[PDB]
Amino acid sequence: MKRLTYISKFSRPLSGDEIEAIGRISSQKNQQANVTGVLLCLDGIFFQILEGEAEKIDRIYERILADERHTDILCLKSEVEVQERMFPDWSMQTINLDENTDFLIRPIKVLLQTLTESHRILEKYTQPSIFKIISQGTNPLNIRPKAVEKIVFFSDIVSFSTFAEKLPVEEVVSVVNSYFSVCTAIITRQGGEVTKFIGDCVMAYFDGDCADQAIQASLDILMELEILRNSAPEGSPLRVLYSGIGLAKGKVIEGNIGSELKRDYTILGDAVNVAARLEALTRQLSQALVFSSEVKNSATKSWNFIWLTDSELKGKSESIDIYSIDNEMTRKSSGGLEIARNIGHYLERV
Amino acid sequence: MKRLTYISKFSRPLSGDEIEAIGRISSQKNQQANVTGVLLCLDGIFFQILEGEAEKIDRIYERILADERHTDILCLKSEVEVQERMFPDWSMQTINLDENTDFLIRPIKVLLQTLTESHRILEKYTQPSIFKIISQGTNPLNIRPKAVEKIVFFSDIVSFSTFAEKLPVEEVVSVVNSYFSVCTAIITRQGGEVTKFIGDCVMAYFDGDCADQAIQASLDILMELEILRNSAPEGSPLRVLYSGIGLAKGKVIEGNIGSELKRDYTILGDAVNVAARLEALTRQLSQALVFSSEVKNSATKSWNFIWLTDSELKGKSESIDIYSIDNEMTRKSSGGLEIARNIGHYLERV
Ligand SMILES: Cc1cc2nc3c(=O)[nH]c(=O)nc-3n(C[C@H](O)[C@H](O)[C@H](O)COP(=O)(O)O)c2cc1C
Ligand SMILES: Cc1cc2nc3c(=O)[nH]c(=O)nc-3n(C[C@H](O)[C@H](O)[C@H](O)COP(=O)(O)O)c2cc1C
C-alpha cells in the first residue's frame, strides 16, 4: 500500500459548516475506495494522513491538490511499500483541534502550530527539488551521488553592477528577485531544476536528453523578459532588465554536496564551468543566448542555429564551437546587450 | 517576558526513571525562577516551551544546551516581548506521549513525529544563519534588505577538475564535503557565515570591521588542511587536497534574494566578485592566500603582510593592490599550488 502525509493552509476562512462538509464527503469517498486515515484541523491549517492502494491514493490526492478550499499543499512523507494500515477502522476520521479544549491537548496544539509555522519558514529557503524527491517517496538524505548527463543552464542580469550602483537597496533586490522568479517559473515548467543562485546569477539543469526543453526554456525566458520590459511602468528599472544565457552539456555528479550541517542536492562538474564561461561571453559575442555544439547537436528540433565562433577557456586546452539561434526574439534580446551598456542615466533617475 | 520553544533528540535511550528525574528537577528549578511551560516526550524526541523573565530563561536555556542527555537542540521560536503566560499554573508540566494511549492523541502523536522528522530533513538543507536569526527572536522572512560593509571570503580546491576526472563519484563527493566541513567549522568559530557553496567553492562573509578574524580564519583553514593532508591514510586523495583563498572588502546588500518559492538570506555586491576574482589569481600569483589592500589596511593586528602585485579585472577600470601574509604555513600552502599541478598520477592510483 501507499501512505501519504501532507499539510495545507486554508485558502480563506472556513466555517463550521464547510469543515464537516469536507469531512463528510471525504469519509464517504474514502469508504468506497477502502482508504483510511485522519484529517486534522488546527487554526487555518490542515493535516491529513491517507492510506490505501497506490492507484486510489493517487487519484484522491489529485482531487485534493485541485481543491480551492486550501493552498500551500505540501507532502511531508510518501510511503509506497506499506504492509499494514495505521488507521484501519476509520475511512476518514476528522478531528478539529480548534473546538478542542481537552487538557493535555492544549500544549500539543500549540506545539503542532509552532512546528508547522517553523516548517513553513524553512520551506521558503529550501530547494524545490528536495520537496519533489520527498513527494516521490525518497528521503533526500540517503540519495547516493551519481554520474549523470545534464544540460546545464547559466544566466545573469546584463550590467547588473549598474543597478546596484544607481538604485536604493530595496529596488535592487526587487529587480533581482523579479528576474529570478521569471527564470525559475519557466525553467520548472519546462522540466528543469533551478539549483543555485549566486549573485545575480541563476544555475539550473535539465536531463541530458532534454536540450530542446533547455533551449525552449531559454527562449521563453527571453520572451517573458520582453513582456516584462515593455509592460513596466514608465521610469521603472524593469524597463532595462536584460539577461544573458549560456547552455552546456556534459557528465556531472549529482548528489548531496556541502558541510556536515548544511548541504545542497545539486550538481558538480565541468559542464557547470563551461555553461558559466559561455554565459560570460554573451557580451563579447553580441548574442543573448549562447550554447555549445554539444547542446546544438543533442537537440532534435529544427531550431534556426547560427554558428558564432570557435574559442576556448580552460583548463583542458580544447576549443569549443559556440552557437545561438537566430530569430526575432534573440535579435531583439541581443540588441539589449548593447542598450544595457549605458543605462546608468536611466537608472539614476528612477 | 521571553518565551522559548525548542526541540531536541535523546543522546541515548532514556529510561522511565531518567525522564521523570528530568521533569522533577526542571519543575523544581523553574518554580524557584517563576518560569512556566511544558516539556513533551515522544519517541526519543523532546519538545519544550519555557516562559519567564528573559534573564532567567537565558540562564535556564544555557544549562539545557549543556545537558548531555539530549543533542541536536534547535530553537524553533524565541519571543522576547511576551506580556502574558501561556502555561501559568505549571512550572514544568512534563507530558510523556510514549506511554499515552488516549484516543485522539494517537493521530496527533504520529503527526507530531512526522512533522519533526520532516523538519530535521529540511534543517540539513538550510543555511545556518537562518536558525541563528530565529534564535535571536527574528523571523528571517521579514528582514528588509540593507547595505552593509563586509569582508567577503572565497575559496576553492586547487586542481579540483583532476579529482573529478580520476576518482569514483563517491570519493569525489567525500573530498569536497570534507573540504567544505573544514572551512565551515573554522569560519563559523571565527564569527563568519558560510553563505553559499558553488561547485567546489565556498563563499562566506564576516563583519566589515572583522578583517583580522577573516585573515585568522583563512590561516586556520590552511593549518587544518595541512593537518588533514599529513594525517590522511597512504594513497588517500586527501593527501593532495589544497585550497586557494581570496578576501575582499566592500559595501554589499544583505537580505532575502531569490525566486518566490526559494530564497537565500545572503549578500550581493561587487566585493563578492572581487573576492572570487582574487581567489582565481592564487595560481598565477603562487600564493595560497590573497586579499585586497582594503582588507590589509582594515586589519589592526601586525600580520606579516607582503605586497604581491598591482593588477585588475572589471568592469570599473581600477587597479587593485594585492597582498598576502608571509609565514611558514602560507609558504607551505603556496608550494602546494605547484604540487597540485600534477596530482593526476597520484589520483589515478587511489
Ligand atoms: C483538507 C481537505 C482534505 C480532503 N481530503 C479528501 C479525502 O481524503 N478523500 C476525498 O475523496 N476527498 C478529500 N477532499 C475533497 C476533494 O478535494 C474533493 O472535493 C472531492 O474528493 C471530489 O469529489 P468528486 O469526486 O465529486 O469530484 C479533501 C478536501 C480538503 C479541502
Ligand atoms: C529535555 C530537557 C529539558 C530540561 N528542561 C529544564 C528546565 O526547563 N529547567 C531547568 O532548570 N532545567 C532543565 N533541564 C535540566 C538542565 O539541563 C540541568 O540538568 C539542570 O537544570 C541544572 O541543574 P544545576 O543548577 O544543579 O546545574 C532539562 C534537561 C533536559 C534533558
mmCIF file of N, CA and C in Angstrom, chain A residues 40 47 49 76-77 86-87 90 95 97 103-108 110-112 115-119 121-122 124-126 130-131 139-141 145 147 169 172-173 177 180-181 184 196-200 203 253 256-263 268, chain B residues 40 47 49 76-77 86-87 90 95 97 103-108 110-112 115-119 121-122 124-126 130-131 139-141 145 147 169 172-173 177 180-181 184 196-200 203 253 256-263 268:
data_model
loop_
_atom_site.group_PDB
_atom_site.id
_atom_site.type_symbol
_atom_site.label_atom_id
_atom_site.label_comp_id
_atom_site.label_asym_id
_atom_site.label_seq_id
_atom_site.Cartn_x
_atom_site.Cartn_y
_atom_site.Cartn_z
ATOM 1 N N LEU A 40 -6.868 16.376 10.221
ATOM 2 C CA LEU A 40 -6.828 17.215 11.376
ATOM 3 C C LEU A 40 -6.939 18.690 11.018
ATOM 4 N N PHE A 47 -3.934 19.042 8.285
ATOM 5 C CA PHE A 47 -3.002 17.925 8.269
ATOM 6 C C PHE A 47 -3.806 16.693 7.895
ATOM 7 N N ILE A 49 -3.379 12.366 6.857
ATOM 8 C CA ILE A 49 -2.741 11.101 6.502
ATOM 9 C C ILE A 49 -3.780 10.248 5.790
ATOM 10 N N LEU A 76 4.640 15.930 3.209
ATOM 11 C CA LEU A 76 5.746 15.717 4.131
ATOM 12 C C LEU A 76 6.315 14.312 4.053
ATOM 13 N N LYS A 77 5.554 13.358 3.522
ATOM 14 C CA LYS A 77 6.004 11.979 3.570
ATOM 15 C C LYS A 77 5.161 11.154 2.611
ATOM 16 N N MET A 86 -2.239 2.148 9.429
ATOM 17 C CA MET A 86 -2.109 2.819 10.718
ATOM 18 C C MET A 86 -3.449 3.220 11.317
ATOM 19 N N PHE A 87 -4.479 3.426 10.497
ATOM 20 C CA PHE A 87 -5.787 3.893 10.967
ATOM 21 C C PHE A 87 -6.898 3.068 10.334
ATOM 22 N N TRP A 90 -11.101 3.609 10.389
ATOM 23 C CA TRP A 90 -11.603 4.917 10.003
ATOM 24 C C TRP A 90 -11.315 5.417 8.600
ATOM 25 N N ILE A 95 -10.807 15.410 12.808
ATOM 26 C CA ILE A 95 -10.604 15.915 14.161
ATOM 27 C C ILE A 95 -10.359 17.410 14.066
ATOM 28 N N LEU A 97 -9.124 20.536 16.154
ATOM 29 C CA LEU A 97 -8.464 20.938 17.394
ATOM 30 C C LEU A 97 -8.826 22.349 17.836
ATOM 31 N N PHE A 103 -7.189 18.642 27.954
ATOM 32 C CA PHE A 103 -6.300 19.262 28.905
ATOM 33 C C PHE A 103 -4.847 19.178 28.447
ATOM 34 N N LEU A 104 -4.364 17.969 28.152
ATOM 35 C CA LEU A 104 -3.030 17.822 27.587
ATOM 36 C C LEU A 104 -3.022 18.033 26.076
ATOM 37 N N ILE A 105 -4.203 18.199 25.474
ATOM 38 C CA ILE A 105 -4.314 18.589 24.073
ATOM 39 C C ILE A 105 -3.779 19.995 23.860
ATOM 40 N N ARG A 106 -4.023 20.885 24.821
ATOM 41 C CA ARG A 106 -3.645 22.284 24.649
ATOM 42 C C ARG A 106 -2.145 22.457 24.442
ATOM 43 N N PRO A 107 -1.251 21.862 25.249
ATOM 44 C CA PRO A 107 0.185 22.020 24.945
ATOM 45 C C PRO A 107 0.588 21.406 23.612
ATOM 46 N N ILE A 108 -0.015 20.276 23.235
ATOM 47 C CA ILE A 108 0.325 19.640 21.967
ATOM 48 C C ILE A 108 -0.147 20.483 20.794
ATOM 49 N N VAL A 110 -0.425 23.895 20.622
ATOM 50 C CA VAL A 110 0.493 24.999 20.354
ATOM 51 C C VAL A 110 1.806 24.449 19.795
ATOM 52 N N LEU A 111 2.202 23.247 20.225
ATOM 53 C CA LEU A 111 3.393 22.604 19.682
ATOM 54 C C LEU A 111 3.240 22.309 18.190
ATOM 55 N N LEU A 112 2.125 21.677 17.811
ATOM 56 C CA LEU A 112 1.823 21.436 16.402
ATOM 57 C C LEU A 112 1.885 22.723 15.593
ATOM 58 N N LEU A 115 5.578 24.069 15.314
ATOM 59 C CA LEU A 115 6.311 23.223 14.382
ATOM 60 C C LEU A 115 5.918 23.520 12.940
ATOM 61 N N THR A 116 4.612 23.660 12.673
ATOM 62 C CA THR A 116 4.158 23.925 11.313
ATOM 63 C C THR A 116 4.623 25.297 10.824
ATOM 64 N N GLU A 117 4.486 26.340 11.646
ATOM 65 C CA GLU A 117 4.900 27.634 11.115
ATOM 66 C C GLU A 117 6.416 27.709 10.968
ATOM 67 N N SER A 118 7.172 27.040 11.844
ATOM 68 C CA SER A 118 8.618 26.937 11.637
ATOM 69 C C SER A 118 8.937 26.200 10.342
ATOM 70 N N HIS A 119 8.196 25.123 10.068
ATOM 71 C CA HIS A 119 8.378 24.360 8.841
ATOM 72 C C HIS A 119 8.112 25.223 7.615
ATOM 73 N N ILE A 121 8.489 28.422 7.304
ATOM 74 C CA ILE A 121 9.629 29.311 7.119
ATOM 75 C C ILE A 121 10.734 28.588 6.368
ATOM 76 N N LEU A 122 11.145 27.421 6.877
ATOM 77 C CA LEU A 122 12.214 26.651 6.254
ATOM 78 C C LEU A 122 11.885 26.267 4.818
ATOM 79 N N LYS A 124 10.609 28.077 2.572
ATOM 80 C CA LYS A 124 10.958 29.185 1.680
ATOM 81 C C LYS A 124 12.444 29.227 1.358
ATOM 82 N N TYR A 125 13.278 28.608 2.184
ATOM 83 C CA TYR A 125 14.717 28.617 1.996
ATOM 84 C C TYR A 125 15.229 27.306 1.415
ATOM 85 N N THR A 126 14.332 26.422 0.978
ATOM 86 C CA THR A 126 14.677 25.062 0.575
ATOM 87 C C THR A 126 14.521 24.879 -0.928
ATOM 88 N N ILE A 130 14.121 19.224 -3.342
ATOM 89 C CA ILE A 130 14.044 18.454 -2.105
ATOM 90 C C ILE A 130 12.612 18.007 -1.833
ATOM 91 N N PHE A 131 11.637 18.894 -2.029
ATOM 92 C CA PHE A 131 10.247 18.507 -1.797
ATOM 93 C C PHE A 131 9.730 17.580 -2.886
ATOM 94 N N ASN A 139 13.726 9.716 0.795
ATOM 95 C CA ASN A 139 14.401 10.637 1.700
ATOM 96 C C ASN A 139 15.629 11.202 0.995
ATOM 97 N N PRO A 140 15.710 12.513 0.763
ATOM 98 C CA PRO A 140 16.881 13.040 0.033
ATOM 99 C C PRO A 140 18.206 12.779 0.726
ATOM 100 N N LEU A 141 18.211 12.656 2.055
ATOM 101 C CA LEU A 141 19.466 12.475 2.771
ATOM 102 C C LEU A 141 20.149 11.161 2.424
ATOM 103 N N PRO A 145 25.550 9.718 -4.409
ATOM 104 C CA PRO A 145 25.991 10.501 -5.572
ATOM 105 C C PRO A 145 26.084 9.639 -6.823
ATOM 106 N N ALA A 147 27.004 9.783 -11.319
ATOM 107 C CA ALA A 147 27.367 10.484 -12.540
ATOM 108 C C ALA A 147 26.174 10.474 -13.490
ATOM 109 N N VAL A 169 18.642 50.081 -2.118
ATOM 110 C CA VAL A 169 18.858 48.649 -1.916
ATOM 111 C C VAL A 169 17.556 47.872 -2.082
ATOM 112 N N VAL A 172 17.039 47.351 -5.783
ATOM 113 C CA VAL A 172 17.967 46.363 -6.343
ATOM 114 C C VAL A 172 17.440 44.952 -6.100
ATOM 115 N N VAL A 173 17.010 44.679 -4.866
ATOM 116 C CA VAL A 173 16.551 43.340 -4.512
ATOM 117 C C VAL A 173 15.257 43.010 -5.252
ATOM 118 N N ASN A 177 15.047 39.728 -7.608
ATOM 119 C CA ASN A 177 14.031 38.738 -7.269
ATOM 120 C C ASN A 177 13.002 38.566 -8.390
ATOM 121 N N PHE A 180 14.800 36.447 -10.985
ATOM 122 C CA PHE A 180 14.897 35.073 -10.517
ATOM 123 C C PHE A 180 13.545 34.372 -10.605
ATOM 124 N N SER A 181 12.455 35.095 -10.319
ATOM 125 C CA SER A 181 11.125 34.477 -10.365
ATOM 126 C C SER A 181 10.716 34.115 -11.787
ATOM 127 N N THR A 184 12.887 31.025 -12.816
ATOM 128 C CA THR A 184 12.526 29.805 -12.098
ATOM 129 C C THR A 184 11.204 29.239 -12.601
ATOM 130 N N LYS A 196 20.771 26.668 -7.938
ATOM 131 C CA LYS A 196 21.526 27.628 -7.146
ATOM 132 C C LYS A 196 21.333 29.038 -7.698
ATOM 133 N N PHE A 197 21.327 30.019 -6.797
ATOM 134 C CA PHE A 197 21.522 31.425 -7.156
ATOM 135 C C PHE A 197 22.858 31.874 -6.590
ATOM 136 N N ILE A 198 23.641 32.583 -7.383
ATOM 137 C CA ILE A 198 24.874 33.164 -6.868
ATOM 138 C C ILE A 198 24.992 34.575 -7.424
ATOM 139 N N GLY A 199 25.005 35.564 -6.542
ATOM 140 C CA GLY A 199 24.929 36.933 -7.020
ATOM 141 C C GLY A 199 23.617 37.124 -7.759
ATOM 142 N N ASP A 200 23.680 37.747 -8.932
ATOM 143 C CA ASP A 200 22.509 37.860 -9.796
ATOM 144 C C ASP A 200 22.451 36.750 -10.833
ATOM 145 N N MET A 203 21.786 29.264 -11.751
ATOM 146 C CA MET A 203 22.297 27.995 -12.241
ATOM 147 C C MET A 203 21.169 26.969 -12.204
ATOM 148 N N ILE A 253 28.365 15.215 -11.552
ATOM 149 C CA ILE A 253 27.994 14.454 -10.368
ATOM 150 C C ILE A 253 26.784 15.125 -9.746
ATOM 151 N N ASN A 256 24.238 15.022 -2.730
ATOM 152 C CA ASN A 256 24.308 15.903 -1.569
ATOM 153 C C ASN A 256 25.736 16.403 -1.373
ATOM 154 N N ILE A 257 25.935 17.710 -1.536
ATOM 155 C CA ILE A 257 27.259 18.326 -1.511
ATOM 156 C C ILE A 257 27.230 19.453 -0.494
ATOM 157 N N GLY A 258 28.135 19.418 0.480
ATOM 158 C CA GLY A 258 28.241 20.529 1.412
ATOM 159 C C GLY A 258 28.944 20.104 2.696
ATOM 160 N N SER A 259 28.794 20.947 3.721
ATOM 161 C CA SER A 259 29.361 20.688 5.039
ATOM 162 C C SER A 259 28.440 19.758 5.826
ATOM 163 N N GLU A 260 28.876 19.390 7.033
ATOM 164 C CA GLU A 260 28.112 18.429 7.824
ATOM 165 C C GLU A 260 26.747 18.988 8.211
ATOM 166 N N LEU A 261 26.667 20.283 8.498
ATOM 167 C CA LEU A 261 25.412 20.880 8.946
ATOM 168 C C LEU A 261 24.570 21.469 7.820
ATOM 169 N N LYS A 262 25.143 21.700 6.634
ATOM 170 C CA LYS A 262 24.401 22.343 5.550
ATOM 171 C C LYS A 262 24.828 21.768 4.205
ATOM 172 N N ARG A 263 23.898 21.114 3.513
ATOM 173 C CA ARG A 263 24.187 20.599 2.185
ATOM 174 C C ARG A 263 23.163 21.105 1.184
ATOM 175 N N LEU A 268 27.809 18.950 -9.729
ATOM 176 C CA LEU A 268 29.215 19.307 -9.704
ATOM 177 C C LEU A 268 29.855 18.747 -10.976
ATOM 178 N N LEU B 40 7.527 18.048 26.587
ATOM 179 C CA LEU B 40 6.882 16.921 25.993
ATOM 180 C C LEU B 40 7.879 15.869 25.529
ATOM 181 N N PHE B 47 10.339 18.127 23.189
ATOM 182 C CA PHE B 47 9.803 19.433 22.837
ATOM 183 C C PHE B 47 9.607 20.188 24.140
ATOM 184 N N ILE B 49 8.533 24.205 25.779
ATOM 185 C CA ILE B 49 8.242 25.636 25.811
ATOM 186 C C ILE B 49 8.529 26.130 27.220
ATOM 187 N N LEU B 76 13.057 26.632 17.782
ATOM 188 C CA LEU B 76 12.093 26.913 16.728
ATOM 189 C C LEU B 76 11.496 28.305 16.833
ATOM 190 N N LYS B 77 11.564 28.928 18.007
ATOM 191 C CA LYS B 77 10.871 30.191 18.183
ATOM 192 C C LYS B 77 11.383 30.858 19.450
ATOM 193 N N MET B 86 1.528 31.622 28.651
ATOM 194 C CA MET B 86 0.685 30.610 28.025
ATOM 195 C C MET B 86 0.393 29.430 28.940
ATOM 196 N N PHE B 87 1.260 29.147 29.912
ATOM 197 C CA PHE B 87 1.112 27.985 30.793
ATOM 198 C C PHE B 87 1.345 28.389 32.241
ATOM 199 N N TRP B 90 1.725 26.023 35.736
ATOM 200 C CA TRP B 90 2.687 24.934 35.694
ATOM 201 C C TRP B 90 4.149 25.270 35.472
ATOM 202 N N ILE B 95 4.956 15.906 30.043
ATOM 203 C CA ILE B 95 3.976 15.029 29.412
ATOM 204 C C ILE B 95 4.734 14.013 28.576
ATOM 205 N N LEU B 97 4.255 11.248 25.787
ATOM 206 C CA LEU B 97 3.309 10.709 24.813
ATOM 207 C C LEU B 97 3.576 9.253 24.458
ATOM 208 N N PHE B 103 -7.178 8.606 22.803
ATOM 209 C CA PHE B 103 -7.777 8.124 21.584
ATOM 210 C C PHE B 103 -7.471 9.049 20.408
ATOM 211 N N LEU B 104 -7.782 10.339 20.544
ATOM 212 C CA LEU B 104 -7.405 11.304 19.521
ATOM 213 C C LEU B 104 -5.967 11.783 19.689
ATOM 214 N N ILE B 105 -5.305 11.370 20.773
ATOM 215 C CA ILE B 105 -3.877 11.608 20.951
ATOM 216 C C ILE B 105 -3.069 10.844 19.917
ATOM 217 N N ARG B 106 -3.505 9.629 19.588
ATOM 218 C CA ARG B 106 -2.730 8.781 18.688
ATOM 219 C C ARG B 106 -2.531 9.420 17.319
ATOM 220 N N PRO B 107 -3.558 9.952 16.636
ATOM 221 C CA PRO B 107 -3.278 10.612 15.346
ATOM 222 C C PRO B 107 -2.392 11.842 15.482
ATOM 223 N N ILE B 108 -2.547 12.610 16.563
ATOM 224 C CA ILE B 108 -1.726 13.800 16.753
ATOM 225 C C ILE B 108 -0.278 13.424 17.020
ATOM 226 N N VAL B 110 1.446 10.703 15.850
ATOM 227 C CA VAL B 110 2.149 10.373 14.613
ATOM 228 C C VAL B 110 2.338 11.640 13.778
ATOM 229 N N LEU B 111 1.390 12.578 13.861
ATOM 230 C CA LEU B 111 1.527 13.856 13.171
ATOM 231 C C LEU B 111 2.724 14.650 13.693
ATOM 232 N N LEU B 112 2.820 14.794 15.019
ATOM 233 C CA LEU B 112 3.974 15.442 15.636
ATOM 234 C C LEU B 112 5.278 14.808 15.176
ATOM 235 N N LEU B 115 5.982 15.562 11.374
ATOM 236 C CA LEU B 115 6.392 16.954 11.245
ATOM 237 C C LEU B 115 7.826 17.155 11.720
ATOM 238 N N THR B 116 8.184 16.562 12.868
ATOM 239 C CA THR B 116 9.533 16.724 13.398
ATOM 240 C C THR B 116 10.574 16.072 12.488
ATOM 241 N N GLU B 117 10.326 14.845 12.023
ATOM 242 C CA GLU B 117 11.372 14.247 11.199
ATOM 243 C C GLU B 117 11.471 14.944 9.846
ATOM 244 N N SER B 118 10.355 15.441 9.305
ATOM 245 C CA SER B 118 10.430 16.270 8.101
ATOM 246 C C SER B 118 11.230 17.542 8.357
ATOM 247 N N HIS B 119 11.012 18.161 9.520
ATOM 248 C CA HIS B 119 11.746 19.361 9.897
ATOM 249 C C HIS B 119 13.241 19.085 9.982
ATOM 250 N N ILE B 121 14.963 16.889 8.344
ATOM 251 C CA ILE B 121 15.485 16.794 6.987
ATOM 252 C C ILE B 121 15.774 18.183 6.443
ATOM 253 N N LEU B 122 14.770 19.066 6.484
ATOM 254 C CA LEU B 122 14.927 20.422 5.970
ATOM 255 C C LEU B 122 16.040 21.181 6.678
ATOM 256 N N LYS B 124 18.918 20.136 7.437
ATOM 257 C CA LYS B 124 20.201 19.808 6.813
ATOM 258 C C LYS B 124 20.444 20.591 5.531
ATOM 259 N N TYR B 125 19.391 21.105 4.908
ATOM 260 C CA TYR B 125 19.499 21.836 3.658
ATOM 261 C C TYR B 125 19.395 23.341 3.862
ATOM 262 N N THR B 126 19.417 23.807 5.111
ATOM 263 C CA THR B 126 19.139 25.199 5.452
ATOM 264 C C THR B 126 20.397 25.909 5.932
ATOM 265 N N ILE B 130 19.974 31.170 9.110
ATOM 266 C CA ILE B 130 18.527 31.212 9.288
ATOM 267 C C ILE B 130 18.142 30.791 10.702
ATOM 268 N N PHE B 131 18.764 29.737 11.226
ATOM 269 C CA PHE B 131 18.441 29.305 12.585
ATOM 270 C C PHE B 131 19.007 30.256 13.628
ATOM 271 N N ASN B 139 11.970 36.667 12.770
ATOM 272 C CA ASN B 139 11.558 35.872 11.621
ATOM 273 C C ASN B 139 12.390 36.290 10.414
ATOM 274 N N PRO B 140 13.192 35.401 9.826
ATOM 275 C CA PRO B 140 14.030 35.834 8.690
ATOM 276 C C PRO B 140 13.238 36.350 7.502
ATOM 277 N N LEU B 141 12.002 35.884 7.317
ATOM 278 C CA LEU B 141 11.229 36.295 6.154
ATOM 279 C C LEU B 141 10.907 37.782 6.165
ATOM 280 N N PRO B 145 16.085 44.278 3.177
ATOM 281 C CA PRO B 145 17.458 44.361 2.657
ATOM 282 C C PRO B 145 18.170 45.608 3.158
ATOM 283 N N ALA B 147 22.191 47.824 3.068
ATOM 284 C CA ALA B 147 23.581 47.960 2.662
ATOM 285 C C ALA B 147 24.471 47.826 3.893
ATOM 286 N N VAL B 169 32.795 8.597 -8.215
ATOM 287 C CA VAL B 169 31.952 9.729 -7.834
ATOM 288 C C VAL B 169 31.801 9.812 -6.320
ATOM 289 N N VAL B 172 34.873 11.554 -4.990
ATOM 290 C CA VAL B 172 34.879 12.987 -5.297
ATOM 291 C C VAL B 172 34.041 13.746 -4.273
ATOM 292 N N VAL B 173 32.838 13.240 -3.991
ATOM 293 C CA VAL B 173 31.932 13.926 -3.077
ATOM 294 C C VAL B 173 32.494 13.907 -1.658
ATOM 295 N N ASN B 177 33.096 17.376 0.334
ATOM 296 C CA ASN B 177 32.386 17.543 1.597
ATOM 297 C C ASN B 177 33.348 17.682 2.781
ATOM 298 N N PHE B 180 34.607 21.261 2.538
ATOM 299 C CA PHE B 180 33.559 22.181 2.952
ATOM 300 C C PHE B 180 33.375 22.148 4.467
ATOM 301 N N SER B 181 33.499 20.963 5.078
ATOM 302 C CA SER B 181 33.314 20.858 6.530
ATOM 303 C C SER B 181 34.430 21.558 7.296
ATOM 304 N N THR B 184 33.838 25.402 6.858
ATOM 305 C CA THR B 184 32.657 25.886 7.571
ATOM 306 C C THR B 184 32.903 25.937 9.074
ATOM 307 N N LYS B 196 27.173 30.342 0.848
ATOM 308 C CA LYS B 196 26.876 29.600 -0.369
ATOM 309 C C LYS B 196 28.019 28.644 -0.698
ATOM 310 N N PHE B 197 27.667 27.492 -1.268
ATOM 311 C CA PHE B 197 28.621 26.634 -1.974
ATOM 312 C C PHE B 197 28.265 26.654 -3.451
ATOM 313 N N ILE B 198 29.261 26.794 -4.308
ATOM 314 C CA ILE B 198 29.015 26.685 -5.741
ATOM 315 C C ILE B 198 30.149 25.872 -6.347
ATOM 316 N N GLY B 199 29.817 24.731 -6.932
ATOM 317 C CA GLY B 199 30.871 23.828 -7.362
ATOM 318 C C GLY B 199 31.671 23.393 -6.148
ATOM 319 N N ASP B 200 32.995 23.432 -6.263
ATOM 320 C CA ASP B 200 33.865 23.175 -5.119
ATOM 321 C C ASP B 200 34.281 24.457 -4.414
ATOM 322 N N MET B 203 31.703 30.394 -0.486
ATOM 323 C CA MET B 203 31.537 31.828 -0.316
ATOM 324 C C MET B 203 31.083 32.098 1.114
ATOM 325 N N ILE B 253 24.823 44.299 -0.405
ATOM 326 C CA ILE B 253 23.439 44.221 0.040
ATOM 327 C C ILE B 253 23.245 42.880 0.721
ATOM 328 N N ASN B 256 17.074 38.819 1.797
ATOM 329 C CA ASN B 256 16.443 37.671 1.158
ATOM 330 C C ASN B 256 16.436 37.849 -0.357
ATOM 331 N N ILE B 257 17.169 36.987 -1.060
ATOM 332 C CA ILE B 257 17.371 37.101 -2.502
ATOM 333 C C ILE B 257 16.984 35.775 -3.132
ATOM 334 N N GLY B 258 16.064 35.803 -4.093
ATOM 335 C CA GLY B 258 15.739 34.587 -4.821
ATOM 336 C C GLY B 258 14.374 34.696 -5.491
ATOM 337 N N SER B 259 13.856 33.534 -5.895
ATOM 338 C CA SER B 259 12.541 33.436 -6.519
ATOM 339 C C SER B 259 11.457 33.407 -5.445
ATOM 340 N N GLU B 260 10.198 33.382 -5.888
ATOM 341 C CA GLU B 260 9.089 33.449 -4.939
ATOM 342 C C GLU B 260 9.059 32.224 -4.032
ATOM 343 N N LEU B 261 9.400 31.053 -4.560
ATOM 344 C CA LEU B 261 9.329 29.823 -3.778
ATOM 345 C C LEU B 261 10.634 29.456 -3.082
ATOM 346 N N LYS B 262 11.769 30.040 -3.481
ATOM 347 C CA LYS B 262 13.057 29.658 -2.905
ATOM 348 C C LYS B 262 13.972 30.874 -2.805
ATOM 349 N N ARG B 263 14.327 31.253 -1.579
ATOM 350 C CA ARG B 263 15.259 32.351 -1.385
ATOM 351 C C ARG B 263 16.424 31.912 -0.515
ATOM 352 N N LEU B 268 24.934 40.351 -1.815
ATOM 353 C CA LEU B 268 25.014 40.704 -3.221
ATOM 354 C C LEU B 268 25.860 41.974 -3.328
#
